[PDB]
Amino acid sequence: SVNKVTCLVCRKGDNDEFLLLCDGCDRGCHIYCHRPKMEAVPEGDWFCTVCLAQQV
């Protein structure tokens, strides 16, 4: 996987150190593509929009 992860928004896999990985699946998102503004990689767990839709 991990070298194969791409950003959900822009679909590229570049700028790895900005490319946030979902804690619930294999998806990712650049912090700079994220809206609302995400200035830094978060310390806690992060879940993508697909994983959120699974929550109750």
């Binding site: 991990v2 992860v5 790895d16 490319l19 946030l20 804690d23 990712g28 978060p42 806690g44 767990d45």
Partner: peptide, 5 residues
């Protein structure tokens, strides 16, 4: 959270 790096 972690990054692809």
């Amino acid at each position: 959270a972690r990054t692809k790096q």
